[PDB]
Amino acid sequence: GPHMTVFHDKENFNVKHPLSCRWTLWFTKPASGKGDNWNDLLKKVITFESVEEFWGIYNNIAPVSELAVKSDYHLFKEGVRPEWEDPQNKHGGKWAYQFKDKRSVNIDELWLHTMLAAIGETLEDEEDGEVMGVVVNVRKGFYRIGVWTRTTEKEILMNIGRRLKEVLKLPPNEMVEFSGHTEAAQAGRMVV
Amino acid sequence: QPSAALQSLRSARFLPGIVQDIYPPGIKSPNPALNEAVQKKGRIFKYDVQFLLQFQNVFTEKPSPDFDQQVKALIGD
């Protein structure tokens, strides 16, 4: 009674579904064809706090399969820039998988499910405090999907990698790989 | 001018966490087993992907009235 969800009336509803934190979608554009912008490519698109907002965003932005080469989407917890130099990423790393063929992959669905696992809090457990964001890279020869973590320490990290492997529907032979962002971090094989 | 759906979104109250008993026929709730183990049930909300996908064809309006033009100007050369 007191609650009308979007499923009860999609025009006139009065409750919405919270996320466990605020999240920000970022977009990295290709270098400008005008020749005057190779160094200011990372754009903050929007910050959101609800499941409904996520879908209003997702339903009104280009899917991965429509992006130009050398574009990225980044979905990061509010306050974390999707750059290794952010204080919350500097000592961290990522689990990542490269899809060696851009055509044999429902990349839009895999990226969507990666974002849904992130915002739905099914990549890591409560108080693991590791997931900072997720990212998809569009490159000439490949797509890459990754989960950025706060540290490089450990069972918490390995389970995140296995959960990503599951979300991406990968068979056992296909390995998701962990790497530190910095050379020092990586200097100090972790695969699932 | 904001869509009716966006007006609703802006004025709606957050649910207090994961709720099981509020959905109409045919709509599944978030998996209660994922949330059984959560301690801070007022802060941490676990939603299975199947639950979240139910919204895909349901909330389709733009998150702001000028969103399309805003994104284009942000990204365009």
PDB file of C-alpha atoms in Angstrom:
ATOM      1  CA  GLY A   1       0.000   0.000   0.000  1.00  0.00           C
ATOM      2  CA  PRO A   2       2.191   2.854   1.247  1.00  0.00           C
ATOM      3  CA  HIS A   3       4.813   1.936  -1.361  1.00  0.00           C
ATOM      4  CA  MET A   4       4.346   2.409  -5.093  1.00  0.00           C
ATOM      5  CA  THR A   5       7.413   1.136  -6.899  1.00  0.00           C
ATOM      6  CA  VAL A   6       8.190   1.789 -10.536  1.00  0.00           C
ATOM      7  CA  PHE A   7       6.714  -1.698 -11.111  1.00  0.00           C
ATOM      8  CA  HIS A   8       3.358  -0.504  -9.766  1.00  0.00           C
ATOM      9  CA  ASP A   9       3.208   2.690 -11.836  1.00  0.00           C
ATOM     10  CA  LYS A  10       6.174   3.662 -13.977  1.00  0.00           C
ATOM     11  CA  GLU A  11       5.070   7.317 -14.236  1.00  0.00           C
ATOM     12  CA  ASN A  12       3.911   7.979 -10.645  1.00  0.00           C
ATOM     13  CA  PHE A  13       5.889   6.030  -8.047  1.00  0.00           C
ATOM     14  CA  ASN A  14       7.037   7.113  -4.578  1.00  0.00           C
ATOM     15  CA  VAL A  15       9.828   4.713  -3.501  1.00  0.00           C
ATOM     16  CA  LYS A  16      13.194   3.955  -5.095  1.00  0.00           C
ATOM     17  CA  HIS A  17      15.897   1.358  -4.515  1.00  0.00           C
ATOM     18  CA  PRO A  18      19.068   2.613  -2.780  1.00  0.00           C
ATOM     19  CA  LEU A  19      22.567   1.629  -3.719  1.00  0.00           C
ATOM     20  CA  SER A  20      25.117   0.944  -0.986  1.00  0.00           C
ATOM     21  CA  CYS A  21      27.052   4.039  -1.975  1.00  0.00           C
ATOM     22  CA  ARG A  22      26.871   6.674  -4.658  1.00  0.00           C
ATOM     23  CA  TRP A  23      28.495   5.791  -7.970  1.00  0.00           C
ATOM     24  CA  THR A  24      29.829   7.929 -10.807  1.00  0.00           C
ATOM     25  CA  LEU A  25      29.939   7.042 -14.458  1.00  0.00           C
ATOM     26  CA  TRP A  26      32.958   8.376 -16.345  1.00  0.00           C
ATOM     27  CA  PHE A  27      33.795   8.274 -20.054  1.00  0.00           C
ATOM     28  CA  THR A  28      37.159   8.548 -21.762  1.00  0.00           C
ATOM     29  CA  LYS A  29      36.846   9.897 -25.299  1.00  0.00           C
ATOM     30  CA  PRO A  30      39.262   9.354 -28.207  1.00  0.00           C
ATOM     31  CA  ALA A  31      41.794  12.080 -28.867  1.00  0.00           C
ATOM     32  CA  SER A  32      40.160  14.885 -30.813  1.00  0.00           C
ATOM     33  CA  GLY A  33      40.255  14.815 -34.589  1.00  0.00           C
ATOM     34  CA  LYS A  34      40.884  18.571 -34.456  1.00  0.00           C
ATOM     35  CA  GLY A  35      44.415  17.766 -33.211  1.00  0.00           C
ATOM     36  CA  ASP A  36      44.068  20.010 -30.141  1.00  0.00           C
ATOM     37  CA  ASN A  37      43.128  17.507 -27.416  1.00  0.00           C
ATOM     38  CA  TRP A  38      45.170  14.422 -26.610  1.00  0.00           C
ATOM     39  CA  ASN A  39      45.537  15.151 -22.871  1.00  0.00           C
ATOM     40  CA  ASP A  40      42.033  16.017 -21.557  1.00  0.00           C
ATOM     41  CA  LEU A  41      40.029  12.948 -22.476  1.00  0.00           C
ATOM     42  CA  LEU A  42      38.502  11.767 -19.147  1.00  0.00           C
ATOM     43  CA  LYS A  43      34.953  13.049 -18.551  1.00  0.00           C
ATOM     44  CA  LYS A  44      32.703  12.784 -15.520  1.00  0.00           C
ATOM     45  CA  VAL A  45      29.215  11.993 -16.808  1.00  0.00           C
ATOM     46  CA  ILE A  46      26.884  11.592 -13.825  1.00  0.00           C
ATOM     47  CA  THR A  47      26.619  10.492 -10.201  1.00  0.00           C
ATOM     48  CA  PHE A  48      23.668   8.372  -9.083  1.00  0.00           C
ATOM     49  CA  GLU A  49      22.302   6.699  -5.959  1.00  0.00           C
ATOM     50  CA  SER A  50      19.497   4.356  -6.991  1.00  0.00           C
ATOM     51  CA  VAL A  51      18.791   1.356  -9.155  1.00  0.00           C
ATOM     52  CA  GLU A  52      16.215   3.360 -11.088  1.00  0.00           C
ATOM     53  CA  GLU A  53      18.736   6.127 -11.840  1.00  0.00           C
ATOM     54  CA  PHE A  54      21.257   3.582 -13.080  1.00  0.00           C
ATOM     55  CA  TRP A  55      18.754   2.337 -15.638  1.00  0.00           C
ATOM     56  CA  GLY A  56      17.783   5.832 -16.755  1.00  0.00           C
ATOM     57  CA  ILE A  57      21.495   6.408 -17.437  1.00  0.00           C
ATOM     58  CA  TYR A  58      22.162   3.035 -19.078  1.00  0.00           C
ATOM     59  CA  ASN A  59      19.088   3.333 -21.324  1.00  0.00           C
ATOM     60  CA  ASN A  60      20.223   6.765 -22.539  1.00  0.00           C
ATOM     61  CA  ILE A  61      23.947   6.316 -23.261  1.00  0.00           C
ATOM     62  CA  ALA A  62      25.807   4.514 -26.024  1.00  0.00           C
ATOM     63  CA  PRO A  63      26.412   0.790 -25.458  1.00  0.00           C
ATOM     64  CA  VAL A  64      30.021  -0.408 -25.549  1.00  0.00           C
ATOM     65  CA  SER A  65      29.517  -1.840 -29.027  1.00  0.00           C
ATOM     66  CA  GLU A  66      28.798   1.675 -30.361  1.00  0.00           C
ATOM     67  CA  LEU A  67      31.911   3.351 -28.968  1.00  0.00           C
ATOM     68  CA  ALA A  68      34.827   4.506 -31.056  1.00  0.00           C
ATOM     69  CA  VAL A  69      38.171   2.796 -30.590  1.00  0.00           C
ATOM     70  CA  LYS A  70      40.193   4.214 -27.694  1.00  0.00           C
ATOM     71  CA  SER A  71      37.114   4.941 -25.612  1.00  0.00           C
ATOM     72  CA  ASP A  72      36.452   3.735 -22.081  1.00  0.00           C
ATOM     73  CA  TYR A  73      33.615   3.628 -19.583  1.00  0.00           C
ATOM     74  CA  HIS A  74      34.438   3.703 -15.884  1.00  0.00           C
ATOM     75  CA  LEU A  75      31.951   3.148 -13.072  1.00  0.00           C
ATOM     76  CA  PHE A  76      33.567   4.161  -9.759  1.00  0.00           C
ATOM     77  CA  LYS A  77      32.434   4.766  -6.226  1.00  0.00           C
ATOM     78  CA  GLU A  78      31.739   8.426  -5.573  1.00  0.00           C
ATOM     79  CA  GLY A  79      34.880  10.338  -4.658  1.00  0.00           C
ATOM     80  CA  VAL A  80      37.311   8.021  -6.495  1.00  0.00           C
ATOM     81  CA  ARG A  81      38.621   9.280  -9.803  1.00  0.00           C
ATOM     82  CA  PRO A  82      39.258   6.358 -12.217  1.00  0.00           C
ATOM     83  CA  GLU A  83      42.968   7.127 -12.406  1.00  0.00           C
ATOM     84  CA  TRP A  84      45.823   5.294 -10.744  1.00  0.00           C
ATOM     85  CA  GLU A  85      47.010   8.546  -9.125  1.00  0.00           C
ATOM     86  CA  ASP A  86      43.831   8.917  -7.047  1.00  0.00           C
ATOM     87  CA  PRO A  87      44.921   8.310  -3.425  1.00  0.00           C
ATOM     88  CA  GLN A  88      42.406   5.458  -3.226  1.00  0.00           C
ATOM     89  CA  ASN A  89      43.864   3.685  -6.312  1.00  0.00           C
ATOM     90  CA  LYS A  90      47.580   4.464  -6.024  1.00  0.00           C
ATOM     91  CA  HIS A  91      48.444   1.346  -3.984  1.00  0.00           C
ATOM     92  CA  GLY A  92      45.804  -0.856  -5.582  1.00  0.00           C
ATOM     93  CA  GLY A  93      45.386  -2.876  -8.721  1.00  0.00           C
ATOM     94  CA  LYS A  94      42.875  -4.616 -10.926  1.00  0.00           C
ATOM     95  CA  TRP A  95      41.476  -7.935 -11.999  1.00  0.00           C
ATOM     96  CA  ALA A  96      41.088  -7.806 -15.762  1.00  0.00           C
ATOM     97  CA  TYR A  97      40.196  -9.922 -18.745  1.00  0.00           C
ATOM     98  CA  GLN A  98      40.953  -9.125 -22.380  1.00  0.00           C
ATOM     99  CA  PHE A  99      38.457 -10.388 -24.955  1.00  0.00           C
ATOM    100  CA  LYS A 100      40.899 -11.140 -27.760  1.00  0.00           C
ATOM    101  CA  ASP A 101      38.149 -10.951 -30.399  1.00  0.00           C
ATOM    102  CA  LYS A 102      35.782  -7.995 -30.491  1.00  0.00           C
ATOM    103  CA  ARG A 103      33.152  -9.824 -32.572  1.00  0.00           C
ATOM    104  CA  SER A 104      32.695 -13.139 -30.722  1.00  0.00           C
ATOM    105  CA  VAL A 105      31.512 -11.392 -27.533  1.00  0.00           C
ATOM    106  CA  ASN A 106      28.179  -9.915 -26.418  1.00  0.00           C
ATOM    107  CA  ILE A 107      30.265  -7.154 -24.941  1.00  0.00           C
ATOM    108  CA  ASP A 108      27.303  -4.930 -24.073  1.00  0.00           C
ATOM    109  CA  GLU A 109      25.709  -7.578 -21.893  1.00  0.00           C
ATOM    110  CA  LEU A 110      29.017  -8.526 -20.251  1.00  0.00           C
ATOM    111  CA  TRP A 111      29.725  -4.887 -19.377  1.00  0.00           C
ATOM    112  CA  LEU A 112      26.146  -4.329 -18.185  1.00  0.00           C
ATOM    113  CA  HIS A 113      26.377  -7.372 -15.930  1.00  0.00           C
ATOM    114  CA  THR A 114      29.744  -6.187 -14.615  1.00  0.00           C
ATOM    115  CA  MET A 115      28.194  -2.841 -13.642  1.00  0.00           C
ATOM    116  CA  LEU A 116      25.167  -4.592 -12.110  1.00  0.00           C
ATOM    117  CA  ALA A 117      27.444  -6.855 -10.050  1.00  0.00           C
ATOM    118  CA  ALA A 118      29.295  -3.742  -8.865  1.00  0.00           C
ATOM    119  CA  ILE A 119      26.296  -1.598  -7.895  1.00  0.00           C
ATOM    120  CA  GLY A 120      24.396  -4.608  -6.578  1.00  0.00           C
ATOM    121  CA  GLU A 121      27.333  -5.452  -4.305  1.00  0.00           C
ATOM    122  CA  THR A 122      27.817  -9.024  -5.546  1.00  0.00           C
ATOM    123  CA  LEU A 123      31.527  -8.705  -6.444  1.00  0.00           C
ATOM    124  CA  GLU A 124      32.768  -8.569  -2.808  1.00  0.00           C
ATOM    125  CA  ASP A 125      31.501  -9.135   0.718  1.00  0.00           C
ATOM    126  CA  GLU A 126      30.500  -6.547   3.303  1.00  0.00           C
ATOM    127  CA  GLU A 127      33.527  -4.725   4.711  1.00  0.00           C
ATOM    128  CA  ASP A 128      35.902  -6.337   2.192  1.00  0.00           C
ATOM    129  CA  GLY A 129      36.447  -2.712   1.272  1.00  0.00           C
ATOM    130  CA  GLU A 130      38.257  -3.611  -1.942  1.00  0.00           C
ATOM    131  CA  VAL A 131      36.144  -2.738  -5.012  1.00  0.00           C
ATOM    132  CA  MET A 132      36.761   0.832  -6.148  1.00  0.00           C
ATOM    133  CA  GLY A 133      35.272   0.692  -9.623  1.00  0.00           C
ATOM    134  CA  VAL A 134      34.832  -1.271 -12.833  1.00  0.00           C
ATOM    135  CA  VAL A 135      36.045  -0.351 -16.309  1.00  0.00           C
ATOM    136  CA  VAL A 136      35.625  -1.372 -19.928  1.00  0.00           C
ATOM    137  CA  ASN A 137      38.256  -0.413 -22.520  1.00  0.00           C
ATOM    138  CA  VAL A 138      37.564  -0.395 -26.262  1.00  0.00           C
ATOM    139  CA  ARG A 139      40.775  -0.885 -28.209  1.00  0.00           C
ATOM    140  CA  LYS A 140      41.587  -1.669 -31.824  1.00  0.00           C
ATOM    141  CA  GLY A 141      42.230  -5.365 -31.312  1.00  0.00           C
ATOM    142  CA  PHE A 142      40.304  -6.118 -28.134  1.00  0.00           C
ATOM    143  CA  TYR A 143      37.923  -5.203 -25.361  1.00  0.00           C
ATOM    144  CA  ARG A 144      39.032  -5.362 -21.744  1.00  0.00           C
ATOM    145  CA  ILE A 145      36.879  -5.469 -18.625  1.00  0.00           C
ATOM    146  CA  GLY A 146      38.359  -4.947 -15.179  1.00  0.00           C
ATOM    147  CA  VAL A 147      37.590  -4.465 -11.498  1.00  0.00           C
ATOM    148  CA  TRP A 148      39.848  -1.955  -9.734  1.00  0.00           C
ATOM    149  CA  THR A 149      40.759  -2.763  -6.125  1.00  0.00           C
ATOM    150  CA  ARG A 150      42.016  -0.683  -3.226  1.00  0.00           C
ATOM    151  CA  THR A 151      44.978  -2.870  -2.329  1.00  0.00           C
ATOM    152  CA  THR A 152      47.221  -5.566  -3.728  1.00  0.00           C
ATOM    153  CA  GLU A 153      47.207  -7.717  -0.567  1.00  0.00           C
ATOM    154  CA  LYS A 154      44.729 -12.741   0.193  1.00  0.00           C
ATOM    155  CA  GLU A 155      41.381 -14.533  -0.014  1.00  0.00           C
ATOM    156  CA  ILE A 156      39.286 -11.383  -0.385  1.00  0.00           C
ATOM    157  CA  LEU A 157      41.031 -10.458  -3.639  1.00  0.00           C
ATOM    158  CA  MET A 158      40.994 -13.965  -5.125  1.00  0.00           C
ATOM    159  CA  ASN A 159      37.244 -14.306  -4.580  1.00  0.00           C
ATOM    160  CA  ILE A 160      36.670 -10.988  -6.342  1.00  0.00           C
ATOM    161  CA  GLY A 161      38.571 -12.353  -9.320  1.00  0.00           C
ATOM    162  CA  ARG A 162      36.517 -15.543  -9.352  1.00  0.00           C
ATOM    163  CA  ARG A 163      33.282 -13.552  -9.138  1.00  0.00           C
ATOM    164  CA  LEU A 164      34.315 -11.431 -12.125  1.00  0.00           C
ATOM    165  CA  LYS A 165      35.143 -14.612 -14.061  1.00  0.00           C
ATOM    166  CA  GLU A 166      31.624 -15.858 -13.272  1.00  0.00           C
ATOM    167  CA  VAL A 167      29.931 -12.594 -14.246  1.00  0.00           C
ATOM    168  CA  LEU A 168      31.799 -12.652 -17.577  1.00  0.00           C
ATOM    169  CA  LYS A 169      30.615 -16.238 -18.148  1.00  0.00           C
ATOM    170  CA  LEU A 170      34.147 -17.367 -18.897  1.00  0.00           C
ATOM    171  CA  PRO A 171      35.023 -21.062 -19.224  1.00  0.00           C
ATOM    172  CA  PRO A 172      37.693 -22.519 -16.912  1.00  0.00           C
ATOM    173  CA  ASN A 173      40.615 -22.156 -19.359  1.00  0.00           C
ATOM    174  CA  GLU A 174      40.116 -18.389 -19.626  1.00  0.00           C
ATOM    175  CA  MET A 175      42.002 -16.616 -16.867  1.00  0.00           C
ATOM    176  CA  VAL A 176      41.324 -13.348 -15.219  1.00  0.00           C
ATOM    177  CA  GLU A 177      44.571 -11.731 -14.082  1.00  0.00           C
ATOM    178  CA  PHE A 178      45.416  -9.440 -11.206  1.00  0.00           C
ATOM    179  CA  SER A 179      48.007  -6.686 -11.585  1.00  0.00           C
ATOM    180  CA  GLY A 180      49.067  -3.679  -9.544  1.00  0.00           C
ATOM    181  CA  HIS A 181      48.655  -0.252 -11.119  1.00  0.00           C
ATOM    182  CA  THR A 182      52.179   0.929 -10.428  1.00  0.00           C
ATOM    183  CA  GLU A 183      55.394  -0.800 -11.313  1.00  0.00           C
ATOM    184  CA  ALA A 184      56.414  -0.785  -7.659  1.00  0.00           C
ATOM    185  CA  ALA A 185      53.039  -2.194  -6.591  1.00  0.00           C
ATOM    186  CA  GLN A 186      53.292  -4.953  -9.213  1.00  0.00           C
ATOM    187  CA  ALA A 187      56.986  -5.547  -8.462  1.00  0.00           C
ATOM    188  CA  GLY A 188      56.178  -6.237  -4.812  1.00  0.00           C
ATOM    189  CA  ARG A 189      51.211 -14.667 -11.236  1.00  0.00           C
ATOM    190  CA  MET A 190      47.801 -14.152  -9.600  1.00  0.00           C
ATOM    191  CA  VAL A 191      45.133 -15.625 -11.879  1.00  0.00           C
ATOM    192  CA  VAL A 192      41.786 -17.340 -11.525  1.00  0.00           C
TER     193      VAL A 192
ATOM    194  CA  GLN B   1      10.595  19.710 -18.668  1.00  0.00           C
ATOM    195  CA  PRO B   2      11.216  16.640 -16.504  1.00  0.00           C
ATOM    196  CA  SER B   3       9.361  13.469 -17.441  1.00  0.00           C
ATOM    197  CA  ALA B   4       6.754  12.115 -15.057  1.00  0.00           C
ATOM    198  CA  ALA B   5       9.090   9.215 -14.263  1.00  0.00           C
ATOM    199  CA  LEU B   6      11.942  11.582 -13.423  1.00  0.00           C
ATOM    200  CA  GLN B   7       9.633  13.764 -11.321  1.00  0.00           C
ATOM    201  CA  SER B   8       8.656  10.627  -9.409  1.00  0.00           C
ATOM    202  CA  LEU B   9      12.293   9.580  -9.023  1.00  0.00           C
ATOM    203  CA  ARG B  10      13.322  12.968  -7.644  1.00  0.00           C
ATOM    204  CA  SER B  11      10.485  13.015  -5.107  1.00  0.00           C
ATOM    205  CA  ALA B  12      10.524   9.332  -4.156  1.00  0.00           C
ATOM    206  CA  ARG B  13      11.803   8.063  -0.819  1.00  0.00           C
ATOM    207  CA  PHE B  14      14.557   5.494  -0.627  1.00  0.00           C
ATOM    208  CA  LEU B  15      13.494   2.079   0.507  1.00  0.00           C
ATOM    209  CA  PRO B  16      15.214   1.426   3.873  1.00  0.00           C
ATOM    210  CA  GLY B  17      17.222  -1.512   2.504  1.00  0.00           C
ATOM    211  CA  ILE B  18      16.313  -4.803   0.875  1.00  0.00           C
ATOM    212  CA  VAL B  19      12.565  -5.479   1.165  1.00  0.00           C
ATOM    213  CA  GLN B  20      10.823  -8.740   0.296  1.00  0.00           C
ATOM    214  CA  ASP B  21       7.094  -8.051   0.416  1.00  0.00           C
ATOM    215  CA  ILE B  22       6.332  -4.985  -1.733  1.00  0.00           C
ATOM    216  CA  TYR B  23       6.454  -6.153  -5.334  1.00  0.00           C
ATOM    217  CA  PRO B  24       3.452  -6.733  -7.612  1.00  0.00           C
ATOM    218  CA  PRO B  25       2.654 -10.098  -9.190  1.00  0.00           C
ATOM    219  CA  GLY B  26       5.292 -11.346 -11.608  1.00  0.00           C
ATOM    220  CA  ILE B  27       8.129  -9.266 -10.093  1.00  0.00           C
ATOM    221  CA  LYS B  28      10.763 -10.993  -7.987  1.00  0.00           C
ATOM    222  CA  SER B  29      12.267  -9.442  -4.871  1.00  0.00           C
ATOM    223  CA  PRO B  30      16.042  -9.291  -4.314  1.00  0.00           C
ATOM    224  CA  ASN B  31      17.396 -12.657  -3.203  1.00  0.00           C
ATOM    225  CA  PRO B  32      17.009 -12.677   0.615  1.00  0.00           C
ATOM    226  CA  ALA B  33      19.836 -15.187   1.020  1.00  0.00           C
ATOM    227  CA  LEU B  34      22.424 -12.679  -0.224  1.00  0.00           C
ATOM    228  CA  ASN B  35      21.331 -10.262   2.468  1.00  0.00           C
ATOM    229  CA  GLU B  36      20.848 -12.715   5.360  1.00  0.00           C
ATOM    230  CA  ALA B  37      24.564 -12.419   6.213  1.00  0.00           C
ATOM    231  CA  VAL B  38      24.831  -8.610   5.934  1.00  0.00           C
ATOM    232  CA  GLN B  39      25.264  -6.924   9.318  1.00  0.00           C
ATOM    233  CA  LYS B  40      24.591  -3.270   8.400  1.00  0.00           C
ATOM    234  CA  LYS B  41      21.250  -3.886   6.719  1.00  0.00           C
ATOM    235  CA  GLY B  42      20.513  -0.160   6.686  1.00  0.00           C
ATOM    236  CA  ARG B  43      23.694   0.599   4.732  1.00  0.00           C
ATOM    237  CA  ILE B  44      24.667  -2.386   2.549  1.00  0.00           C
ATOM    238  CA  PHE B  45      22.112  -3.642   0.004  1.00  0.00           C
ATOM    239  CA  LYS B  46      22.823  -6.784  -2.036  1.00  0.00           C
ATOM    240  CA  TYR B  47      20.829  -7.093  -5.279  1.00  0.00           C
ATOM    241  CA  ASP B  48      21.190 -10.102  -7.527  1.00  0.00           C
ATOM    242  CA  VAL B  49      21.613  -9.391 -11.216  1.00  0.00           C
ATOM    243  CA  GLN B  50      18.290 -11.049 -12.100  1.00  0.00           C
ATOM    244  CA  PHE B  51      16.453  -8.655  -9.789  1.00  0.00           C
ATOM    245  CA  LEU B  52      18.229  -5.651 -11.252  1.00  0.00           C
ATOM    246  CA  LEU B  53      17.509  -6.674 -14.852  1.00  0.00           C
ATOM    247  CA  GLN B  54      13.765  -6.390 -14.181  1.00  0.00           C
ATOM    248  CA  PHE B  55      14.148  -2.613 -14.338  1.00  0.00           C
ATOM    249  CA  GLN B  56      15.701  -2.511 -17.819  1.00  0.00           C
ATOM    250  CA  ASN B  57      12.471  -1.921 -19.747  1.00  0.00           C
ATOM    251  CA  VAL B  58      10.743  -0.153 -16.852  1.00  0.00           C
ATOM    252  CA  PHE B  59      12.840   2.931 -16.103  1.00  0.00           C
ATOM    253  CA  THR B  60      13.893   4.179 -19.525  1.00  0.00           C
ATOM    254  CA  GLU B  61      13.620   7.944 -19.179  1.00  0.00           C
ATOM    255  CA  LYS B  62      16.565  10.283 -19.073  1.00  0.00           C
ATOM    256  CA  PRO B  63      18.106  11.071 -15.665  1.00  0.00           C
ATOM    257  CA  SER B  64      17.976  14.812 -16.413  1.00  0.00           C
ATOM    258  CA  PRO B  65      15.930  16.870 -18.896  1.00  0.00           C
ATOM    259  CA  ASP B  66      18.931  17.976 -20.987  1.00  0.00           C
ATOM    260  CA  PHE B  67      20.918  14.762 -20.557  1.00  0.00           C
ATOM    261  CA  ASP B  68      21.419  14.029 -24.249  1.00  0.00           C
ATOM    262  CA  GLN B  69      22.733  17.503 -25.096  1.00  0.00           C
ATOM    263  CA  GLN B  70      24.806  17.527 -21.896  1.00  0.00           C
ATOM    264  CA  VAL B  71      26.582  14.282 -22.786  1.00  0.00           C
ATOM    265  CA  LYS B  72      27.149  15.397 -26.377  1.00  0.00           C
ATOM    266  CA  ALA B  73      28.794  18.654 -25.274  1.00  0.00           C
ATOM    267  CA  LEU B  74      30.883  16.852 -22.670  1.00  0.00           C
ATOM    268  CA  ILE B  75      32.272  14.376 -25.222  1.00  0.00           C
ATOM    269  CA  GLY B  76      32.192  16.006 -28.648  1.00  0.00           C
ATOM    270  CA  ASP B  77      35.326  17.422 -30.238  1.00  0.00           C
TER     271      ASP B  77
END
